[PDB]
Amino acid sequence: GGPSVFLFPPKPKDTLMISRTPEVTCVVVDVSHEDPEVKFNWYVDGVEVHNAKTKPREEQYNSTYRVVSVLTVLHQDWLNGKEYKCKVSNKALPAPIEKTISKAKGQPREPQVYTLPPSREEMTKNQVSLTCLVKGFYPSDIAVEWESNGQPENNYKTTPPVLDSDGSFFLYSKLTVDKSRWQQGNVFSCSVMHEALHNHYTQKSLSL
Amino acid sequence: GGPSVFLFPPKPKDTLMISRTPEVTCVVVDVSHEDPEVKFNWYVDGVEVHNAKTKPREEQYNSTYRVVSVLTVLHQDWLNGKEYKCKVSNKALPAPIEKTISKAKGQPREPQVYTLPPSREEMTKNQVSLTCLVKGFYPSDIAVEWESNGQPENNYKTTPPVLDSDGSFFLYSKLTVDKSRWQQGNVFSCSVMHEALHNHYTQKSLSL
Ligand SMILES: *[C@@H]1O[C@H](CO)[C@@H](O[C@@H]2O[C@H](CO)[C@@H](O[C@@H]3O[C@H](CO[C@H]4O[C@H](CO)[C@@H](O)[C@H](O)[C@@H]4O[C@@H]4O[C@H](CO)[C@@H](O[C@@H]5O[C@H](CO)[C@H](O)[C@H](O)[C@H]5O)[C@H](O)[C@H]4NC(C)=O)[C@@H](O)[C@H](O[C@H]4O[C@H](CO)[C@@H](O)[C@H](O)[C@@H]4O[C@@H]4O[C@H](CO)[C@@H](O)[C@H](O)[C@H]4NC(C)=O)[C@@H]3O)[C@H](O)[C@H]2NC(C)=O)[C@H](O)[C@H]1NC(C)=O
Numbered sequence: 001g002g003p004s005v006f007l008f009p010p011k012p013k014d015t016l017m018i019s020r021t022p023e024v025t026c027v028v029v030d031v032s033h034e035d036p037e038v039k040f041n042w043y044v045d046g047v048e049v050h051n052a053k054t055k056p057r058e059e060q061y062n063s064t065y066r067v068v069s070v071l072t073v074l075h076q077d078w079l080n081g082k083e084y085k086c087k088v089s090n091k092a093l094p095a096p097i098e099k100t101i102s103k104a105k106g107q108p109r110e111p112q113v114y115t116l117p118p119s120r121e122e123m124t125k126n127q128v129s130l131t132c133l134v135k136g137f138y139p140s141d142i143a144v145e146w147e148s149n150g151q152p153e154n155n156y157k158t159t160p161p162v163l164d165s166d167g168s169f170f171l172y173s174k175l176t177v178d179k180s181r182w183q184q185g186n187v188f189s190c191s192v193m194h195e196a197l198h199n200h201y202t203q204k205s206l207s208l
Numbered sequence: 209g210g211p212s213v214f215l216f217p218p219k220p221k222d223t224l225m226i227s228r229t230p231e232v233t234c235v236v237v238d239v240s241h242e243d244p245e246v247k248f249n250w251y252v253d254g255v256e257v258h259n260a261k262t263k264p265r266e267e268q269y270n271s272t273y274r275v276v277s278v279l280t281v282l283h284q285d286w287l288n289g290k291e292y293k294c295k296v297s298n299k300a301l302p303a304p305i306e307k308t309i310s311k312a313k314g315q316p317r318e319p320q321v322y323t324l325p326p327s328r329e330e331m332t333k334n335q336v337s338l339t340c341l342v343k344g345f346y347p348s349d350i351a352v353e354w355e356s357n358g359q360p361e362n363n364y365k366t367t368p369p370v371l372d373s374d375g376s377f378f379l380y381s382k383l384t385v386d387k388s389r390w391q392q393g394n395v396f397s398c399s400v401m402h403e404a405l406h407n408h409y410t411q412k413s414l415s416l
């Protein structure tokens with residue numbers, strides 16, 4: 001009917017990488033052509049802030065607009081658990097819509113990072129699987145990459161985080177390599193970024 | 209507004225286990241108190257069938273009913289890729305709603321099942337991780353369990369299937385065991401059920 005609001009968190013990497021810019025994004029869909037004006041109020045821990053920026057209005061081909069406000073967050077503010085509230089007013093609403101988002105609550109726990117070599121049974125294939133088990137972490141926001149000889153290794157896939165029986169998360173990352181590249185003693189590494197790691201970073205190596 | 213329809217597939221286990229009964233479920237929500245009658249037509253490969261059964265009507269506390277029709281499917285029919293169509297008629301609809309479901313399309317590929325022992329680095333803990341990598345499978349419907357000494361081992365978690373770079377799926381299953389149970393040479397097994405396995409079943413063992 002009238003507008004709907006969806007509020008999105010930053011990317012885990014952006015909150016953990018010094019390079020990138022974490023932002024909270026408040027998306028308003030089904031804004032009418034009759035009432036395209038939307039007012040945003042933003043609050044951080046209940047304190048109203050005034051540095052949000054509205055993205056270019058996006059007109060959809062179902063006769064609605066999509067209007068989006070972005071609030072840049074301090075890395076430390078997000079990781080410290082601050083509460084971000086977006087309030088949306090529009091003439092087609094009988095009352096403003098409010099959404100609130102934050103990092104998951106609970107004591108952070110440091111990932112344990114374990115590298116597992118290919119199974120002997122897999123050595124009948126041309127390509128073999130290098131496994132990085134990351135477990136015991138909380139909250140679930142995390143990033144995982146691989147390297148080899150100082151260079152990024154990109155032929156990998158990582159599972160979503162899975163809730164474990166002790167209330168931490170685990171996941172696995174699988175890097176696929178030419179078997180010969182493995183047999184030649186090349187050194188591979190699994191890099192993990194998470195808030196409860198020293199400098200938000202660790203790497204563990206794996207080689208034959 | 210008026211009713212909505214959601215059509216659900218069988219459980220992978222039910223389609224792969226000789227014991228259990230696979231069914232397709234056509235769920236109609238937001239059925240009004242003014243118009244509670246819903247007519248279902250079911251089609252298998254475009255052929256109308258007449259052996260569906262309607263579940264007991266469920267009245268919700270938002271002044272709507274939930275009405276559900278269940279069609280039992282032959283194991284072989286689902287795995288052979290038959291198309292199941294549910295057609296829903298109701299007075300509040302301007303036209304019937306139709307939904308169609310089937311198994312994912314594409315050539316099946318047999319899972320490769322590899323067991324990986326705990327990392328040496330993990331042996332500083334009281335509990336260690338036994339890993340079952342299942343890869344190269346298609347379609348994604350699969351079930352995984354663990355055993356030890358002929359008995360079911362239940363302290364495990366399995367990742368959802370992840371789409372790999374070659375268009376097959378992989379996943380990992382993690383069984384957590386007392387370290388001493390591992391060091392004592394107990395034999396653990398990862399059991400996998402999938403349509404492209406011989407007898408829809410395989411198991412691989414792991415021990416120190
Ligand atoms: C007219 O046409 C319109 C265009 O087609 C159409 O608009 C759509 O409306 C939909 C609803 O009507 C709306 O659906 C929601 O989608 C949510 C997910 O949205 C993302 O992912 C989509 C698919 O991948 C994308 O299309 C979206 O753009 C969005 O993508 C994300 O965007 C964010 C913000 O930009 C971005 O994050 C930012 O990224 C940047 C970098 O780019 C930085 O990193 C920033 O730091 C960062 O903030 C993401 O990266 C990007 N991600 C992706 C994957 O692309 C979805 O979550 C909603 O689901 C909830 O609500 C529905 C009910 O509608 C429930 O069915 C569902 O279960 C979910 O409900 C929640 O469940 C929770 C339970 O765990 C519960 O806790 C919650 O309370 C509960 N909430 C609710 C409300 O129930 C939802 O499906 C869709 O996004 C719109 N599409 C577009 C393109 O705008 C419109 O509907 C049409 N009008 C008609 C038909 O009348």
Ligand SMILES: *[C@@H]1O[C@H](CO)[C@@H](O[C@@H]2O[C@H](CO)[C@@H](O[C@@H]3O[C@H](CO[C@H]4O[C@H](CO)[C@@H](O)[C@H](O)[C@@H]4O[C@@H]4O[C@H](CO)[C@@H](O[C@@H]5O[C@H](CO)[C@H](O)[C@H](O)[C@H]5O)[C@H](O)[C@H]4NC(C)=O)[C@@H](O)[C@H](O[C@H]4O[C@H](CO)[C@@H](O)[C@H](O)[C@@H]4O[C@@H]4O[C@H](CO)[C@@H](O)[C@H](O)[C@H]4NC(C)=O)[C@@H]3O)[C@H](O)[C@H]2NC(C)=O)[C@H](O)[C@H]1NC(C)=O
Pocket residue numbers: 212214216217218219222229230231232233235237238268269270272274
């Ligand atoms: C009045 O109050 C009502 C009750 O609260 C409320 O009813 C709800 O309405 C919702 C929509 O308005 C409806 O939402 C949909 O939910 C879908 C998932 O439903 C399941 O999982 C839920 C949460 O876990 C459960 O609540 C549901 O019961 C259902 O659970 C499953 O049930 C099936 C069938 O029984 C069962 O399978 C069977 O199990 C048995 C054993 O028990 C056997 O094994 C059988 O063999 C087997 O068949 C499952 O096990 C069971 N699973 C679980 C997990 O419990 C959800 O999938 C829908 O999402 C789609 O649509 C929404 C739009 O509404 C999108 O936002 C979303 O992105 C999805 O869209 C799809 O996206 C695809 C992209 O990949 C795309 O390909 C599709 O085209 C696209 N489709 C559409 C339509 O867009 C959806 O969220 C909810 O289920 C209702 N809840 C209940 C309890 O009925 C009602 O709304 C209220 N009225 C109001 C507010 O006015």
